[PDB]
Amino acid sequence: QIAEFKEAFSLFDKDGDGTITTKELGTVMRSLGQNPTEAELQDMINEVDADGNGTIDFPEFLTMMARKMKDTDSEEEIREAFRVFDKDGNGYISAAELRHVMTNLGEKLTDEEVDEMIREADIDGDGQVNYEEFVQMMTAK
Amino acid sequence: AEFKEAFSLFDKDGDGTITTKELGTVMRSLGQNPTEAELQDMINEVDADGNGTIDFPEFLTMMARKMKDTDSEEEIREAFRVFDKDGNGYISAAELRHVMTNLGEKLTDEEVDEMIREADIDGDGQVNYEEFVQMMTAK
Amino acid sequence: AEFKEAFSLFDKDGDGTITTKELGTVMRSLGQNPTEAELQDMINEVDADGNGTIDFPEFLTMMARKMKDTDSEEEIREAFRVFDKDGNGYISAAELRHVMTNLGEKLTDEEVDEMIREADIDGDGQVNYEEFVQMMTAK
Amino acid sequence: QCMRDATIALQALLRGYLVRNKYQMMLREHKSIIIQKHVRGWLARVHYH
């Protein structure tokens, strides 16, 4: 709870001012555990207080989390997902195909986000990924 | 209803073009509802005769030329028949399959067998077609 | 934590000044744990640019300016990892050498070798890190 | 739509995984720093012990 989260907050505070930049709201939520979309963050970064604010304190954030808790919790449910590239039902997809789905489809990720992700994803010597194991690792928490 | 992002989900390769035969599925992905006939007429009224693929500009010009007919297909919310005349509110699964697979722009039997999964059928052999039309669209 | 007596043991000449490169060691003889980075930042935020040595007054003014950061380095009495998540209470000697000699303000392999003298290692190859942190600090 | 929703969930989860890894790595470096530092407080051990 709040002790691990305070240590996460104290790592996001870099200046040591007690307050983190409002831009780093969606990384702090995600660091604690949650997954939120960057739309959901925009719909709860707005306020009359935090919309006007340049930085946010740990009491403010704890207040935001309490207000939006249900929606915020709803982001942690997803453990199962389905994806094609595999049509033949091998259970495997290439790293090229994974990069194409992540960077070319949906909200779109960057290549740097995908390159970051493939530092904590098993990839065999063929260059393929078991996508059932990959979904389990990403949801793992 | 043009959407570049929808085009970029049909383009998978990133060539900037999609096959001329994926035109009906792209219009229908967008929001529109054109017949397979209307889709062919839209292609045939352009000298896209020899064209194997379409770019987003070409697709934009076709939708703008045919906006009125294409918009008409997303007006409707209710659907009558003309199959029933008694006004029983019921149609036989045989007549329902016949209108779907024998009239108009025919569905396959496998498409129809999918839509009659979970659809109740009485001891006469008739289905409530109002519930069946609602269950197909309202999903 | 200023101490004139501690300064008089660094001053071995009775000049009144000590070398600017013995500033980190003087802080860590007083009490204070400052990082090698923190030590460089405190020197760099004074125009002690050309200064070859520091007097006790200069050292006093630096500690008073930086009291808040420097005090923080002597709060900590415990030390969790974040290199066990299973909660086995054990870490491999390989991971323990890697954090020490590859992460942060890197120790030398000879320094790490000194700290693993008389440190028990099982048949898996793992060390009780809680005992190892206590055995390093409580001395 | 269902394929697009499955892709957005995948990249939201990936973004939530990445930051946790990046935080975890930062904590590993920060943990090393504060132990390396406490050991080099043993200039004390040389000076009086």
Domains and CATH numbers, chain C: 1-69 (1.10.238.10), 70-138 (1.10.238.10)
Binary contact (D23, A138; C-beta < 8 A): no
Non-local (6+) Cβ contacts of A94 within 8 A are A85, A127, A128, A129
Residues in D closer than 8 angstroms to C107, CB to CB, are: 36, 39
- b (16+ CB within 10 A) / e for D11-40: bbbbbbbbbbebbeeebbeebbbbbbbbbb
CA distance B84 to B90: 7
Please report the DSSP string for A56-89 in residue order: EEHHHHHHHHHHHHHHHHHTT--------S-SS-
Q: What are phi and psi of B63, to 5 degrees?
A: -65, -40
Chain C interface, best mutation among D20, D21, D29, D39, by max C CB count within 10 A: D39
Which chains are adjacent to chain A, needing at least 3 Cβ pairs under 8 Å?
B, D
Neighbours of C27 (CB within 10 A): 25
Of B83, B77, B66, B72, residue with least CA distance to B126? B83
Residue type, C13: D
Non-local (6+) Cβ contacts of A40 within 8 A are A71, A75
Q: What are phi and psi of B85, to 5 degrees?
A: -135, -25
How many separate helices (H) and strands (E) can be counted in chain C? 8, 4
CA atoms within 13 A on the CB side of B70: 22
Q: What is chain A's alpha carbon radius of gyration, rounded to the nearest angstrom?
A: 18
CA distance C51 to C38: 18
Measured in residues, chain D has a length of 49
Measured in residues, chain C has a length of 139
By what method was this entry solved? electron diffraction
CA distance C30 to D14: 47
CB contact D28 to A (< 8 Å) = no
| Token code pair at residue B108 | 């396959």
Three-state DSSP class for residue D19: helix
Q: Pairing between strand B53-55 and B17-19?
A: antiparallel
CA distance C76 to chain D (A): 9
Task: Give the A-side interface with B, CB within 8 Å.
Answer: 100, 104-105
Helices A58-74 and A25-32, packing angle to 10 deg: 60
In the block, tokens 């992460």 appear at C103
CA distance B91 to B97: 10
Helix (H) / strand (E) element for B67: namely helix B67-72
Question: How far are the Cα atoms of A7, A16, C63 from residue C68, in angstroms, in the given order?
Answer: 19, 11, 9
Binary contact (D12, A107; C-beta < 8 A): yes
Of C105, C103, C38, residue with least CA distance to C72? C38
Instruction: Tell whether C78 is in a known binding site.
Output: no
Q: What are phi and psi of C118, to 5 degrees?
A: 70, 15
The answer to whether the CB of B116 falls within 8 A of the CB of B93 is yes
Which chains are adjacent to chain B, needing at least 3 Cβ pairs under 8 Å?
A
Binary contact (D38, C79; C-beta < 8 A): yes
CA distance A131 to A91: 6
Three-state DSSP class for residue B117: coil
Of C103, B33, B54, residue with least CA distance to D28? C103
Neighbours of B20 (CB within 10 A): 16
This PDB structure is determined at a resolution in Å of: 24.0
Count Cβ atoms within 10 A of the Cβ of residue A105 and give its class: 0-12 exposed, 13-18 middle, 19 or more buried.
buried
Residues in A closer than 8 angstroms to D8, CB to CB, are: 37, 106-107
**Where is the binding site, in residues of A?**
13, 15, 17, 19, 24, 49, 51, 53, 55, 60, 86, 88, 90, 92, 97, 122, 124, 126, 128, 133
CA atoms within 13 A on the CB side of C8: 3
Non-local (6+) Cβ contacts of C32 within 8 A are C1, C70, C73, C74, D41
Measured in residues, chain A has a length of 141
Of C65, C17, C18, residue with least CA distance to C38? C65
C97: left (phi over 0), alpha (psi -120 to 50) or beta: alpha
Q: What are phi and psi of B2, to 5 degrees?
A: -60, 140
| Token code pair at residue A49 | 């207080």
Binary contact (D37, C33; C-beta < 8 A): yes
Helix (H) / strand (E) element for C18: namely strand C17-19
Three-state DSSP class for residue D20: helix
Torsion of CA B117, B120, B121, B127, to 10 degrees: -100
**CA B113, B117, B122 angle in degrees (round to 5)?**
105
CB contact D29 to C (< 8 Å) = yes
Of B102, D1, B122, residue with least CA distance to B131? B122
Of D4, B3, B60, B2, residue with least CA distance to A104? D4
For C99, name the nearest residue in chain D, comparing CA atoms only: D32
CA distance A135 to B85: 54
| Token code pair at residue B54 | 């379409």
Residues in A closer than 8 angstroms to D13, CB to CB, are: 35, 78, 138-139
Of D19, D37, D33, D32, residue with least CA distance to A12? D19
Which of A11, A30, A101 has the CB atom closest to D15's CB atom? A30
| Token code pair at residue B113 | 């067998």
| Token code pair at residue D21 | 């890894």
SS3 percent helix, strand, coil of chain A, rounded to 5, is: 50, 10, 40
